[PDB]
Amino acid sequence: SHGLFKKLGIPGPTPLPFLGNILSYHKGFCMFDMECHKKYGKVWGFYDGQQPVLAITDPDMIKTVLVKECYSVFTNRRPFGPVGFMKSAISIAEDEEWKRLRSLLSPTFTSGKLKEMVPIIAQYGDVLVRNLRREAETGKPVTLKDVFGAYSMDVITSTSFGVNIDSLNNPQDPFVENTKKLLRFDFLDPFFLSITVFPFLIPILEVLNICVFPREVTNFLRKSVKRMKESRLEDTHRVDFLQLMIDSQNALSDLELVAQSIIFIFAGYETTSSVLSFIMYELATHPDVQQKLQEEIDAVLPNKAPPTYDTVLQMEYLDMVVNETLRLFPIAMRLERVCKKDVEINGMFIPKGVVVMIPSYALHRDPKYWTEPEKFLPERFSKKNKDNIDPYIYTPFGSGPRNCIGMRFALMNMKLALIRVLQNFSFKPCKETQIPLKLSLGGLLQPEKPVVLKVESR
Ligand code: HEM
Ligand SMILES: CC(C)(C)OC(=O)N[C@H](CSCCC(=O)NCc1cccnc1)Cc1c[nH]c2ccccc12
């Protein structure tokens, strides 16, 4: 097992028995990835316990796996942990099961569908400024994660389900409470450290019904969504996510409906608020850019005009800012696909069962692609420069048919928030503000201490 890469002629850190190369994650595993790049070059291998994982950095080879050969060989991600009824969630499903889920759910974010969500979010656009406005008065610092979290939440519930829960009215909300308690993925947390390293214990916990959210958060939402379904089940309106799954129960199912709902609620809450917090951090430690964006917004939307679908896409510099923030903090860290048969991609033999890994975080910081890769430089994404940029190196949303199904909704939502927040306020560091920011070594791409900034009226 541990002789695969030495035999296949592929370089790597020498694994230990049982552990594999586990102990190298103490640094945080984005750093591990970095080092390996710099040390081993353009392809390397390592072992998550007894699981061989082959990292790849070549743009062609990446394209092959993410795009050309997705259907035939590289179809699924690495088996998650114990997931019980969540095994049917789109992000976790495999093969035939996945293909249908993907085609059935993709019509949720289209040219028209997103368009229909603007006026709805717009209400929470309003409700956010009004939240901040009262802290803007007081003067003592603000945790963005929380204010953004509450926004994110409102926007996901109301769009997917057409259910206003007005979480911005509520630093006392059941939903954000249970939903945030959802993940325990810390690399250096006792739990998952034991699974990829005892992967044969997964089949066990499944029997026990012990989950990565043991019965609590899911029981909540189980009957929670059971609640939303029935109201709609009679009262006629809008054809939405909730609805599109009632359209296909005319070959979908009940626990199956609940599962995608959860995936969405998590994604829409956590991804969105986390990134939005990194963007505000940057705008504060880079005042020039904050002002320059505040100019773009004012010019396109004069007299603090309400943002819209088409005005949003008009904003070049906004987009540059978003893309640049994502270059630095590509929240997935790594893209992964399991090799489901013996294969040869661009000259290299890859054996069945191997996990092929793309280290987004590291490629986003590769000194051999990006001048001053540590520095936050939005201009590197201008129309002049936006085309020297390999879409198989810069991949914050993955690529190919298994890429981020939420991408377009993510961008609009985020931007829709930024616009409204920057046309009413400015943002500046204080002496809680960690300069420069530090990522936690724990498995998530998080700031180790929360992001806290000062908010002034305009
Ligand atoms: C800025 C926020 C976000 C980032 C950076 C992001 C990034 C990603 C990335 C990189 C992948 C995997 C791509 C690949 O492996 O090739 C992904 C998968 C996915 N994302 Fe997004 N995402 C974001 C927001 C969202 C939102 C708001 C939703 C809600 C709809 C969403 C739903 C999904 C689903 C369901 C998958 C698995 C796709 C599949 O297996 O078919 N994500 N996310
Ligand atoms: C645990 C559960 C079922 C609630 O969600 C997951 O599937 N877990 C993964 C890890 S969650 C943190 C990753 C992150 O910061 N956001 C990335 C993301 C999440 C959701 C949608 N779009 C982007 C979440 C996950 C689902 N599919 C993935 C593919 C690659 C990497 C992570 C994920």
UniProtKB/Swiss-Prot annotation:
Changing residue 90 to V: In allele CYP3A4*4; significant decrease in catalytic efficiency. It catalyses: an organic molecule + reduced [NADPH--hemoprotein reductase] + O2 = an alcohol + oxidized [NADPH--hemoprotein reductase] + H2O + H(+); 17beta-estradiol + reduced [NADPH--hemoprotein reductase] + O2 = 2-hydroxy-17beta-estradiol + oxidized [NADPH--hemoprotein reductase] + H2O + H(+); 17beta-estradiol + reduced [NADPH--hemoprotein reductase] + O2 = 4-hydroxy-17beta-estradiol + oxidized [NADPH--hemoprotein reductase] + H2O + H(+); 17beta-estradiol + reduced [NADPH--hemoprotein reductase] + O2 = 16alpha,17beta-estriol + oxidized [NADPH--hemoprotein reductase] + H2O + H(+). Its EC number is 1.14.14.1, 1.14.14.56, 1.14.14.73, 1.14.14.55. Belongs to the cytochrome P450 family. Activated by cytochrome b5. This is Cytochrome P450 3A4. It is linked to Vitamin D-dependent rickets 3: An autosomal dominant disorder of vitamin D metabolism resulting in early-onset rickets, reduced serum levels of the vitamin D metabolites 25-hydroxyvitamin D and 1,25-dihydroxyvitamin D, and deficient responsiveness to parent and activated forms of vitamin D. Changing residue 378 to L: In allele CYP3A4*13; lack of expression. It is a single-pass membrane protein. Changing residue 263 to T: In VDDR3; 10-fold increased activity towards calcitriol; no effect in protein abundance; decreased activity for non-vitamin D substrates. PANTHER family: CYTOCHROME P450 3A4 (PTHR24302:SF48), CYTOCHROME P450 FAMILY 3 (PTHR24302). It holds the Pfam family p450. GO terms for biological process: aflatoxin metabolic process; alkaloid catabolic process; androgen metabolic process; cholesterol metabolic process; estrogen metabolic process; lipid hydroxylation; lipid metabolic process; long-chain fatty acid biosynthetic process. GO terms for molecular function: 1,8-cineole 2-exo-monooxygenase activity; 1-alpha,25-dihydroxyvitamin D3 23-hydroxylase activity; anandamide 11,12 epoxidase activity; anandamide 14,15 epoxidase activity; anandamide 8,9 epoxidase activity; caffeine oxidase activity; enzyme binding; estrogen 16-alpha-hydroxylase activity. Heme binds at residue 404. Keywords: Disease variant, Endoplasmic reticulum, Fatty acid metabolism, Heme, Iron, Lipid biosynthesis, Lipid metabolism, Membrane, Metal-binding, Microsome, Monooxygenase, Oxidoreductase, Steroid biosynthesis, Steroid metabolism, Sterol metabolism, Transmembrane, Transmembrane helix, Ubl conjugation. Changing residue 102 to Q: In allele CYP3A4*8. Changing residue 325 to M: In allele CYP3A4*11; unstable form. Gene3D superfamilies: Cytochrome P450.
